[PDB]
Symmetry: D3
């Protein structure tokens, strides 16, 4: 069984600063969301993320990650992530889960 | 059952102007395609879109959406979508459908 | 049955020049990877690729393709691909395979 | 998708005489039932029948068939079947359908 | 997901007398077994029973039922059942469960 | 994936005597068939057998087994089996295989 949805991260003025896990990256920032499946699994499904909306400032490099932090039978944690001097005006992630 | 394919939207000189559904966005433009499954379903499958080709002008912001408008047992409507002064030289969407 | 993973292509200083399959594109370059499933299929699965990390130079156009070259019951060939004067500092592809 | 149920044919005093399709068999008799799935398929499912109740007269040979006549996406035709001088006091068929 | 196994009820000298649920039947007797799946489901699977071994006394009528009492995500209750003056020397039930 | 079919064992005058695997049973006889799937699996499917035709002599006890000897990705070995002084005029086994 298969479910899908979309996460809208919005403008990065709304994202949280987080510690960087890469010493070559600073000003690491993200919008993390815990998603609850509209039907829990008995064991974690496979999840794939896709970036289906981007609005990014041209005067600075494009730096984006769609992160999948963890997955459980009832949902998952994912984030829109950026760093350094990138400005993201909007980013959305589509996802699918397959049992 | 699982199907996949790719939609090539090409250069936005070929896209249609459409009414904007967001008053903060103007010059909204898209390449819409109705895809017919190579095997109809009995009820709509789950569809996920992925942007697997982008060629975008660096002097203006990157603004892209891969839209899924609707899905039926025999196919779906999807578009490459941009707005304002972005120039897209090519954009392609890969898709998968899962019954 | 469903498998997934991620391919990290890294900085394009590490990519290979390849012959261009499009006369309108030069300096065609890619990082190709042959992935071996953590469980072989009896006939090729359906595979979808998603670009889940991009770090690209703003002073030149964004030009990226996530290519799926071929798929077999035991794995597939995919690449991160760019051309002309684009500079990619990092690119990663997430994939899912469904029997 | 998987469905199941049971057909109770009861005492053969209630069965219909039918033409014999085997010249070595006479007094061919059956209880035929058309079953409608509690959820139609798009193409015929695979159906298996199992005889899960028998009450048969010991003074004559045991002669029973559980017949599957035909199967469609929305149901199937099955019968309890006997012949010659057998007496069946009750017979029930359990079935399963798998898409 | 699909599991199967077999229940051997043996000689009815080993079966339990049970109250009859049919006033037309007396001396109702059965061998009931609670089966635990070799892998629990999240919600009850569909189960089908099949009588795959019978050794029955010819001087009395053949009277047998393979009963499915109940089914849960982790197993099911089934019995070999007879009544009146039938003698069963052995009876075995094969089963399959499909999620 | 799901396949089914039927094995017709016919009159036991055609069955082979086999060594008995039970010292309490003599004159052990069977009709063994190796079935080849109309589509090989990559690993053995689950198989269930059902006795869907019986014609047995009333003057001797009913003694029948539907045996599943072994199963492989491309087929299985099954038999109609009887013993002692039982006479089987016809026996047929229906089967289903589920990947
Ligand atoms: C300190 C920091 O975040 N540095 C970043 C580096 O991580 C990389 O993204 C580069 C190319 O875009 O831009 C900056 O140098
Ligand atoms: C009117 C219009 O389309 N305005 C756009 C806005 O929607 C947003 O995309 C922004 C950042 O890229 O660029 C412009 O201001
Ligand atoms: C020769 C070559 O690669 N030319 C490229 C062309 O293929 C297209 O990518 C364009 C817009 O970004 O940029 C350059 O003109
Ligand atoms: C004419 C007729 O039905 N004949 C039947 C034959 O078909 C077979 O069932 C046999 C053994 O039970 O009993 C009778 O001879
Ligand atoms: C009281 C009782 O169990 N009566 C049984 C009846 O239920 C039915 O099985 C019949 C034919 O075999 O044999 C007997 O009459
Ligand atoms: C030696 C032999 O096969 N003996 C059989 C025994 O196995 C059992 O089937 C019994 C009741 O039907 O009938 C005979 O005694
Ligand atoms: C969100 O749920 C995930 C489980 O997938 C857990 O790892 C994470 O820490 C949770 N955080 C919050 C604040 O809900
Ligand atoms: C395309 O098909 C979709 C159904 O998925 C429908 O909603 C849409 O309006 C159709 N448009 C055209 C012109 O085919
Ligand atoms: C990688 O494996 C693929 C099969 O999917 C094959 O087409 C390709 O040429 C192989 N190349 C290398 C050097 O392994
Ligand atoms: C019952 O439905 C079946 C289709 O599976 C058809 O073949 C059969 O003749 C029907 N008969 C009656 C009277 O409904
Ligand atoms: C066996 O388990 C079933 C559940 O499927 C329950 O209904 C039944 O009463 C149990 N009985 C015993 C004694 O275990
Ligand atoms: C039939 O094939 C089975 C494999 O399922 C094997 O065990 C058996 O011995 C074979 N016998 C014959 C003579 O084909
Ligand atoms: Zn800097
Ligand atoms: Zn502007
Ligand atoms: Zn140039
Ligand atoms: Zn006769
Ligand atoms: Zn009596
Ligand atoms: Zn004897």
């Amino acid at each position: 069984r298969v479910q899908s949805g979309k996460i809208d991260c919005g403008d990065d003025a709304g994202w949280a600063k987080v510690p960087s896990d890469d010493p070559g990256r600073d000003n690491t920032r993200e919008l993390a969301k815990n998603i609850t499946f509209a039907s829990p699994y008995c064991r974690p499904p496979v999840v794939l993320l896709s970036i289906t909306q981007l609005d990014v400032e041209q005067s600075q490099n494009l730096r984006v990650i769609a992160r999948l932090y963890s997955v459980s039978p009832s949902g998952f944690k994912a984030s829109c992530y950026t760093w350094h001097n990138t400005k993201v005006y909007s980013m959305s992630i589509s996802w699918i889960s397959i049992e």
